[PDB]
């Protein structure tokens, strides 16, 4: 019964048919829309959650999840430190000419130029393979300075967190590091997956990371400068295999912060709260503040009990629709719903938004709102068949601000 | 295994040439061999023309949408074939002397239709309500629109499809079209799938289309103006579900042409060869003339029975790698191979170029060439994590031409 946008729990339930028509008139269909108020409320509440649990906590902005410059700026304005996983992302942040050049540099591939600038700005660099530690050392001699680094750890003692990415925690690697000159171990990094709703996995990882920081404490007389627990917390959209049809409530960030931090408080207290605790939540912060407006542009079948419709948005506009049941809302005053097949604007057999959803009868020109698409869609748009659609911010004054102009030939 | 001993059109490519390409345009880097590409194009036109004089090769824009490549095929005699309003507009911006164009696809917006109806384009509709939108536009212009009907060859088991009018009461659809003012049936369009290696599916479709064209001629005394047989012929790369690991030879176009045309010559001669016969092959024409140069940038494991390496290109640079076993060649000199895992420059579980290929031991700075990437990769590049790489044309003269500049922030 919450099929209708105005009757939903969506951030965008406030949007009338008239407002949607105006957005599309100005910026064309399909159109991404981002609500600034909801987005920055979530950002600030996350900072409160972690700081209430540990006062030397730092929220880092996961650029890859939502890489629009304007959004990065706004999270930076409330105290987030940019976190990048590539040299391009690293240089994106530099071009923003931010006053505070603090930055977290992750990723399996950091080119030489990126690592030079990073060292000059004393970024926090977390390495996940050995050859990179060596390349940083040679740079750390040419550049007459010692380089602090962190090590990405794989929580391979936890079955659900096992990963080939990072040094496995199942030590020989740290013995080598300290005989290495110009390199000084300064932190740990661990990122165990994505869309994690079983926060037992965060407890497990935090316990093993704490045991590691304790063993590093004794076998090496070293207190870590930072512990980065990555991201991975679940968003609001159920997976397609999930039996739940309705979206989840945005995950309780106080529950997340208390669960993951609890196994680490013992170590952090010995360090007199000088070890920084870093969090890199992306999806769970940004997903539900972004929706896609799409228009029905054709009909293949239309009978009492079934309709097959063509939309102007498909899997090349929101690729994560192939993995998640993103909520789909309509604008009709109509009680009778029928099985509905929503096809994208491609005659490719995998380009559909949903094959088993119940919606009222729709026709050419009707609009749908696809909610919870704020993570890992916009920046994956491409120029295949259809050019990239507009991205609009509903700013904190309820005024539209274009963040990406619709592409044209 | 090694590039020099390969059957690849880049077999001829030197380490110094490759290192020059990368030094000049960075890694990863797409390369397109002009000679191989246009030779394939001419052979296809020659194949279909020797079977039927009024055969027209159409260029599948979506398969390889770089403007320069489009212009080349246009100069060889190909007519542009588009499947979206954006592609349509891309072609008009080329300002070709001959405005002939094929307009396919499930979504054609009003602006493109108004333009296409007044440029004598062959417009193939796949759902009825598009027909009615054309009819109403045509009435505003006081013209009668000639349209083609996309047909689903649902009598052939492998060709069953939702896209197009079902050929299995199809005549109930053309009966309705006969009554609609400002519309006249003029052509048929059939596109039965992709990466089709069983040409029995083409011969079956051509026979069914021939029968439909005969019935139309007898029921409505109507001789069709064109028959569009679509594309879909297979490329050189096996699927990952394929048991075979080595690339196939480029499919025999003479065989394809002779077999798909033969069921239609009774009709086409009955028409004194005035029906135009259009072909829209893409993958099979362009895939093997394009390769991706990638560089090893790190190591995770290195035994003599197994190695796990990090490349600077992944599924976001060549997304068809998740579906196809694209040939991967090295430039070294060594007999000894080992199970090799090639990890993309992302720490996502699914970002790997190949997880059980045997390759010589490779190290940081070593280079690989992934062949057969010319279909459905370049235009799907995006700005997620890594910006888009350069695309380089290897001229007729073996000189380098920049078709897409490396992207930077
Ligand atoms: C993906 C990722 C994140 C964010 O992950 P989410 O699921 O969106 O929360 C943070 N840090 C790193 C290193 C990552 O790879
Ligand atoms: C995809 C497509 C083509 C090209 O298909 P290929 O497999 O690359 O040969 C031609 N015409 C239409 C309508 C298409 O959708």
Residue numbers in the entry:
A (entry chain C): 0 to 169, 178 to 238, 239C, 240 to 416
B (entry chain A): 2 to 169, 176 to 238, 239C, 240 to 416
Study authors write:
The X-ray crystal structure was solved to 2.1 Å resolution by single-wavelength anomalous diffraction using incorporated selenomethionine to phase the structure. Two functional dimers were found in the asymmetric unit (four monomers), and all four active sites showed good density for the cofactor PLP. FigC is composed of an N-terminal β/α-barrel domain and a C-terminal β-barrel domain, typical of the AR-fold PLP-dependent decarboxylases. The FigC active site is positioned at both the monomer domain interface and the dimer interface between the N-terminal β/α-barrel of one subunit and the β-barrel domain of the second. A Schiff base is formed between the PLP cofactor and the conserved catalytic lysine (K63 in FigC). Additional conserved residues with demonstrated roles in the catalytic cycle in these eukaryotic ODC enzymes are also observed to make key contacts with PLP in the FigC structure. These include E287, which interacts with the pyridine nitrogen of PLP to facilitate decarboxylation by stabilizing the carbanion intermediate; the glycine loop (G237–239) and R290, which form important backbone amide interactions with the phosphate of PLP contributing to tight binding; H198, which stacks against the PLP ring, and R151 positioned near the PLP hydroxyl. Additionally, C354, shown to function as a catalytic base in eukaryotic ODCs, is also conserved in FigC and contributes to the active site from across the dimer interface. First, the 310-helix has rotated out of the pocket to a greater extent than for any of the other structural homologs, and it projects two threonine residues (T327 and T330) and a tyrosine (Y331) into the pocket, all of which are likely to be in position to interact with the substrate based on the docked structure. The aspartate positioned next to the catalytic cysteine in L/ODC, ADC, and DAPDC, which interacts with the substrate side-chain amino group has been replaced by M355 in FigC. Finally the FigC structure has also evolved to use additional structural elements that are deeper in the pocket for substrate binding (e.g., R387), elements that were not needed for binding to the smaller substrates preferred by other enzymes in the family.
